Structures are given as C-alpha cells and as structure tokens.
Amino acid sequence: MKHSLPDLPYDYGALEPHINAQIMQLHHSKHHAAYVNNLNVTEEKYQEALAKGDVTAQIALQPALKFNGGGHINHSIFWTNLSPNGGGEPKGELLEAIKRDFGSFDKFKEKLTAASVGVQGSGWGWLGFNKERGHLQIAACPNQDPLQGTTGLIPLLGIDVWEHAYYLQYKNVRPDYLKAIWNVINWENVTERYMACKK
Amino acid sequence: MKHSLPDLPYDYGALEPHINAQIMQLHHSKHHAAYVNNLNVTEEKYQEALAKGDVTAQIALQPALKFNGGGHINHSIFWTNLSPNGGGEPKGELLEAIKRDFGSFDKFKEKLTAASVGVQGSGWGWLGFNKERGHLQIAACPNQDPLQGTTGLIPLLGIDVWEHAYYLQYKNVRPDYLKAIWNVINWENVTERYMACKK
Amino acid sequence: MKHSLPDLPYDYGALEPHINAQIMQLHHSKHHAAYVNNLNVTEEKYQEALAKGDVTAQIALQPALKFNGGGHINHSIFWTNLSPNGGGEPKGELLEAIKRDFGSFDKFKEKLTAASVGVQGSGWGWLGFNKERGHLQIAACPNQDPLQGTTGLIPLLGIDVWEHAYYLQYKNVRPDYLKAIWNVINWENVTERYMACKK
Amino acid sequence: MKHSLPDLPYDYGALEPHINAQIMQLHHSKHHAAYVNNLNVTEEKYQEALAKGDVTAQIALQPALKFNGGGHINHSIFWTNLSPNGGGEPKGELLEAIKRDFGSFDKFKEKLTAASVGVQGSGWGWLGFNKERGHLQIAACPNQDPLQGTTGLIPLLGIDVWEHAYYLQYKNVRPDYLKAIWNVINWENVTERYMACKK
Ligand SMILES: [Mn+2]
Ligand SMILES: [Mn+2]
Ligand SMILES: [Mn+2]
Ligand SMILES: [Mn+2]
C-alpha cells in the first residue's frame, strides 16, 4: 500500500542540546528513509512470491521485512515521542499509572533507563501498555523488532539505543544520552497513546 | 492458488521395520496436514495485512508463516527422501561429490548423523547444495526453519529429528532412529535433486 | 559438589489416567536423567575452560549449559508441580493473586493454556512471580530455556510441552494433554513457591 | 585467569585515511576496554555461581559472557588483521586458496563485502577456515558472537560492522567503509593464521 517517510514534526535542531541537529538529520533523512525504501522493495518482492506460492522466497524475505518494517514502525513512533516543548513529567492518569505500576516517576525513569542501557548491540527500550493486564510494562527489543508486532504490548514511549541515535554526540557514553533525552520527552504524545489504549 | 497436502508415495507400512506405520500415518495425516492448513490460514491473513499496509500485523504473522510454511516445505521433501526401495549408497555423480566433499560415504553419514543428533529441541539435519560454491554442504535447522529459505542451500536430503518423527517406536533413543533411517533413504530422489542443481 | 537426579515424589502410575506410567517413567528415568548427567559433563568442561581463560571454549559450551542446565531446573520444578493429590483450585493468597492479576481462575487457566499450546516446537509454559512488580506473570520459554535464568521471573508452575511429555498418550493432540494436566496440578506446591516470593 | 586489553600493534592514526584516529582510539581504549572489563566482572560472578551450584545464575550470566567474551575475542583478532603496511593482495598458498575457493581475489572481496554489508544491526563479517572441509569459508556473526565459538570456523580475517567501527567518519555509508578497509588489511597476519590451520 506504499510506505512513505513521515515529515519530522519539528526542525532538525529543535531537540538541541540534548540530541544535536546532525544526528536528527541523519537519523530521519538517511536511516529512517532507508528503512522505508527497503521496506517498499521487500514488500513488492513478497507480493511476487505470494502470487507465485513460493514459500521459500517468502521466508527468505522475512528478515528484511521485520528489519525495515520494524525500523519504519519504531522511528515513526519515536519522532512523535520527542518535542522541543517536551521534558518534565506527565500529568493526570498517565502519571497516576506510572506511580501505581512503578512506584514513582523517578523509579520509572530508572527502570526504563536500565532497560535501555542494558540492550547489548542494537535495539530499543520501551514503555508499553499491556491491554490484557490493563497496566504499564517496560520491555526491550533487539535490532528493529517492533514492540507490538513481537510482544503485543502497545507502544507508548520508545528510546532508540542504536549507536547511530547518539554516537556522533555522546560517543560510547550511552548513559549520558539517556539522561539527556528526558528533557525532550513529549509527554503530550505519550499521554495520547496511553488514553487511546482505554475504551 | 493454494497449498495442498501431497499424498504419501507409498503405503503407511512400507518403511517397516525401520519406521512403523503408526508413525507414518500420524506424521503425514496429522502433522503435515496441520502445517499445510495453518500455512494457508497464515498466508490469507498476511495477504490481508500486506494490502492494508499493516506492518505490525505482517510482522506478528512471521513466526507462524515460517513455522507452518517451513513445515510444509520440509515434510514435502522428506516424504520423497524416503522409499521402501531405498537404502544402500547413491551412485554416479552424487556419490562422487560425497567422496570429494566429505572424504567417503561413511564419513558423510557420520557428519549428517552428528548434525541431526546434535539438534537441541526440535529441528532437522540437512544435506544441501551450495550453489555459490558449487559443492555439497551439511547444515542443521531449528524447529521448521526451512533450509533454502534460511540459509540459501538447495535441499537434497533432510532428516526430521522432531520427537514425533521417532518417539512412538524409539522413545528417547534418537540415535536408534538415525541408524534405522539410513535403510530407507531414497538415493534416487536425492540424486535427482542433486543433478537439478548442476547445469 | 554435583547435581543429582531427584527421586519422583510419587509412583510412576500415580497420575493415571491423566499422564500414563510409561510417560512418567521415560520422562523421569530417561529424559531428566540425561539432562542431569550431561549438565555435570558440561559444567566440568566449563570449569576447565574458565580456569584456562579459554573464552572460545566457554562460549562454545553455552548452548549445552543452558539446554541441560535448564533441563535440570525445569524438570526438578515440574515433578513437584504435579501430584496425585492435585487438581482443583488453589486456596488463600495465591487464589487471591490469580483473581487480582488475571480476573479469575478460569481466565488464568486459558492464558496459561494459550501460552503452552502456542509454543512452536519444544518449550514450556510458565506461571511466574515478577519480584520487581510484585505480581504474577505468564511467560513461555523455548526448548529448556529456564524461566528465572532467562527472564528473571520466579517459577511457580510450569507446563512441559515437549512432545515427549505427552506424545505416547495424546499423540499430536497437545490440547488434550493440556486439558488433562489441570487434574494433577499440585497447588500446595505452587502456593508454597508463591508464599516464598512474598516477604 | 584475568583478561587484559592488548596493546594496539600500531599508532591510533596508523590506519589513516581509511579509518581515522578518533575511531581507532575510541574503538580500542573505550569499546574493547569495556568488553575486557565487563568480561572479567562476569567471569568472577560465574565462578561464584559455579562454586554455589547455582545453574540459574550461570544461565543468567551467559548473555554478558558471550557479549563481552566475544567482544574481546573479535577485537583482539581485528587489530592484528590491520596494519599501516597493509593493503594489496596476499601471496602464496592463501592467494591460491582464495582463487580456488572463491574464483579470484576480486570475487572474494565482493563476497566478503556482501556478507559484511548484509549484517542487519550490529555484527561481523568473517573469512574463516573450515578445518573439517579443509577450505576457506565466509560467514557473518551477529553482535559479538565469535566465529570459532559459535560456528567452529577458524578466524582468518574479520570486518567489524558495528556502527562504532565507522560511523564517526562514514556515517550511515557502510559500503564506503568496506571499500576503504581493503587498503589496510594485514595479509601477513591473515597468511599466518591460514598457515597455522594446516599441520
Ligand atoms: Mn534509529
Ligand atoms: Mn515432522
Ligand atoms: Mn520434558
Ligand atoms: Mn567493534
């Protein structure tokens, strides 16, 4: 059905000094663009194999489908999770859910930071919503494996810990990047995603 | 177009005493039948998701697509790899390739046996053809991961080491099953698959 | 110090008609016995590699360490999770936690059944305790990957869905085995494991 | 047995302009150093669990052992695979093996480049020696999974395609990094590793 690179909801430098403009521009215009481009190529090749009934070709295409498809899913959410007007704490029912499920907002930040810094290799840290249990949940995903597609949790807030998300600015020091990104979390967007999870 | 369960090319009791009739009937009429049906179900849900551009739904279906699709691929080859007219050693160029790539037929049997008995959990041992290198190659695959779809090798001979392939007759002693199955290998079919790889 | 095969706490035929005596004897005296012995073999080779600083040899041994070590861990819990005095529903705080975290005992049974029947290939379904969140949690594990070692959840109740756990009696119909096993769950043991988690 | 960060066999700027000095210094003094440091911590924790017979703790430590242990193995080989005096083509039996197993030196470069650029996420491209088959073989490894520990192939030449190996200089354009690194391949070292594989 054709996938497209979404416009960034802000200027490439809007998240400075926490994530610099060179990273944002590369991350959106090169990395996410490649995922979209390679996803469209892979989807067309899957339509051919499916019409041909070639199951071997379908299975051979699965790694590229999950990698680029997950990449598209994850980054499309990620851009909306950040804002130049972000930072601080959420309000209302989301903040109450965070206190109820994690103890406090500070304890939640520790848990999500720990999950993000604990990713060995490329991956993502996620705050998600468990619809079956009706409460928040933190999970980590490898490479571009998307949260809902691989675990069923509804994504609320994602932290990209691929090296291209921080290396130009923070080099190997991923914890400095994790501390900085809290200043640009768009809690308005995370609240919207949380409210959508409830009828 | 759909996928269908192939008829077994021989009687359910044709491979006794090496593989008994209760195993052959369950393995074909229950296990393979389930894979083919569930593959068609999974493909239909993927057909819908692909047209809808729902990448999350596509990625969520990948485990079932590889598992049932691989199940169909692997067992369809497996039935042709066995025959009451089987056993012994291959002839002609396949035997020459085995001696060239593995040293001898007996050395090849140990390597394929070792790969099959070495599967921890469910899986398959494979003799394949490496098209890029132009020679034979042995590999092991977990669960129903199909050989060509996951490694690119062209399948020539597969050994199913799922417990349902032997447990009723050999119980926990997988090596006893592996010793017996050499008596029913259809080297005519494996030779046909090998000759198709070279041109 | 070594690891040893624990005696089964009941007769091999004590769980009939739900799990027959041939399965119980093979499962304990053949399968679990193999895991314990091979675990001790693998640990000794790792003991040597660790003292030698041979990291390649250590890493090569990890699949066998997790597989046989998990095999020992999982089955040692499994035997205590079953009893001829089992069946029915738990009492006290465990039942209260089940109702609180899953809605009802019946809803909990479906979720654990769904996780167990959903294992593609060999594996286990688990009811566990999340120490960080302080509540119950269901998870599925592949092959012999143990629950606490791979996810941190404390094991309370495990359902072995390897084919050797049911095939002789129920053949391919894993749901028939899952329905039967609820009749022999030792809720006294699961309650003991749950109460140890809270302090 | 205590692991230590090996000295780099050359100056941090010795591989310029192909890999810049900032990358080499970060790669050796920060990334490899961390692998060594975290490996030593993990090994000490494994000795405690092993003496305690805590198999759960051993299995929980396996990801960090493979990650940091593999990281140490892979980078220790990598530094020796490069040299300011490198580039060009190998001579003697290694060059003959490359021509025999891959067709030509240029075709081999294409195959190893393709394997390296094909790594989705973090990982490594390897030219290895298959001792059982007695010929060269190309393989790719995810994250820090070491070649010999996970596949049995003897490592001859490794290409690190983690983003920290090239991103500061080449950004997202991994193919430009792969083309440049051929100018500093230490074929003297690769030849030594190849000759050691033969009696
Ligand atoms: Mn990214
Ligand atoms: Mn089968
Ligand atoms: Mn078992
Ligand atoms: Mn590196």
Please state, in angstroms and rounded to a whole number, the distance separating the CA atoms of residues A35 and A89: 32
Kindly report the CATH number assigned to the domain that includes residue C73.
Answer: 1.10.287.990
Integer angstrom CA distances of residue C104 from A134, C15, C158, D124: 15, 26, 19, 49
Set of chain A residues whose Cβ sits within 8 Å of the Cβ of B62: 62, 65-66
For residue B134, give how far its alpha carbon lies from the nearest alpha carbon of chain D (Å).
10
In a domain, A61, yes or no: yes
Are B101 and B192 in a shared domain? yes
Residue position matching structure tokens 């690179």: A5
Tell me the ligand closest to B144's alpha carbon.
2
Domain count, chain A: 2
At which of D81, D108, D129 does a domain end? D81
B163–C168 CB contact, under 8 Å: no
Tell me the ligand closest to A28's alpha carbon.
1
- Closest residue of A to C103, CA-based? A133
Do the Cβ atoms of B166 and B174 come closer than 8 Å?
yes
Residue ranges in chain D assigned as alpha helix (H): 21-26, 33-52, 55-80, 92-102, 105-117, 147-151, 167-170, 174-181, 187-196
CB D180: neighbour CB atoms within 10 A? 16
At which of B46, B81, B116 does a domain end? B81
Please state, in angstroms and rounded to a whole number, the distance separating the CA atoms of residues A137 and A2: 32
Q: Output the known binding site of B for Mn(2+).
A: 27, 75, 160, 164
In a domain, B86, yes or no: no
Ion ligand 4: residues, Cβ under 5 Å: D 160, 162, 165
Q: Which of A195, A192, A190, A184 is nearest to A10 (CA)?
A: A184
Closest Cβ opposite residue A62 in set B55, B56, B62: B62
Please state, in angstroms and rounded to a whole number, the distance separating the CA atoms of residues A61 and B46: 13
Please state, in angstroms and rounded to a whole number, the distance separating the CA atoms of residues A171 and C29: 55
A62–B57 CB contact, under 8 Å: no
For residue C141, give how far its alpha carbon lies from the nearest alpha carbon of chain B (Å).
12
Mutation choice for A interface testing from D38, D122, D169, D174 by most A CBs within 10 A: D122
At which of A46, A61, A81 does a domain end? A81
Closest Cβ opposite residue D149 in set C50, C56, C145: C56
Are D119 and D71 in a shared domain? no
Ion ligand 3: residues, Cβ under 5 Å: C 160, 162, 165
Q: Does D160 carry a binding-site annotation? A: yes
In a domain, C4, yes or no: no
In a domain, D8, yes or no: no
Set of chain B residues whose Cβ sits within 8 Å of the Cβ of C168: 167-168
Closest Cβ opposite residue C52 in set D1, D65, D149: D1
In a domain, C7, yes or no: no
Integer angstrom CA distances of residue C160 from B34, B160, C82, C188: 21, 21, 11, 19
Beta carbons within 8 Å of B173's beta carbon, 6+ residues apart? none
The experimental resolution of this structure, in angstroms, equals 1.8
Integer angstrom CA distances of residue D40 from A69, C50, D46, D55, D73: 38, 11, 10, 19, 13
Q: Does D135 carry a binding-site annotation? A: no
Please state, in angstroms and rounded to a whole number, the distance separating the CA atoms of residues A107 and A89: 13
Q: Is the preceding omega at residue A155 within 30 degrees of 0, hence cis?
A: no
Are D76 and D168 in a shared domain? no
Are D53 and D103 in a shared domain? no
Query: How many Å from the N-terminal Cα to the C-terminal Cα in chain B?
Result: 30
Please state, in angstroms and rounded to a whole number, the distance separating the CA atoms of residues A182 and A158: 12
For residue D164, give how far its alpha carbon lies from the nearest alpha carbon of chain A (Å).
7
Q: What are chain C's partners, defined as 3 or more CB pairs within 8 angstroms?
A: A, B, D
Helix, strand or coil for residue A86? coil
Are D96 and D193 in a shared domain? yes
Please state, in angstroms and rounded to a whole number, the distance separating the CA atoms of residues C15 and C180: 10
Are D74 and D115 in a shared domain? no
- Closest residue of C to A140, CA-based? C151
D1–C66 CB contact, under 8 Å: no
Tell me the ligand closest to A144's alpha carbon.
1
In a domain, A108, yes or no: yes
The C-alpha R_g of chain A, in whole angstroms, comes to 17
Residues spanned by the domain of A148: 92-197
The DSSP-derived string for B5-17 is PPPPSS-TTTTTT
For residue B139, give how far its alpha carbon lies from the nearest alpha carbon of chain D (Å).
11
Do the Cβ atoms of A84 and B77 come closer than 8 Å?
no
Kindly report the CATH number assigned to the domain that includes residue A134.
Answer: 3.55.40.20
Please state, in angstroms and rounded to a whole number, the distance separating the CA atoms of residues D10 and D22: 14
Question: In which order are the strands placed within the sheet that holds B123-130?
Answer: B135-142, B123-130, B154-160
Are C176 and C113 in a shared domain? yes
In a domain, A126, yes or no: yes
Set of chain D residues whose Cβ sits within 8 Å of the Cβ of B111: 132
For residue C122, give how far its alpha carbon lies from the nearest alpha carbon of chain B (Å).
6
Are D99 and D176 in a shared domain? yes
B149–A56 CB contact, under 8 Å: yes
In a domain, A151, yes or no: yes
Are A182 and A99 in a shared domain? yes
Query: How was this one solved?
Result: X-ray
Are B44 and B114 in a shared domain? no
Are D58 and D128 in a shared domain? no
Are A62 and A159 in a shared domain? no
Please state, in angstroms and rounded to a whole number, the distance separating the CA atoms of residues D4 and C192: 46
Do the Cβ atoms of A69 and A146 come closer than 8 Å?
yes
CB pairs B-C closer than 8 Å: 55
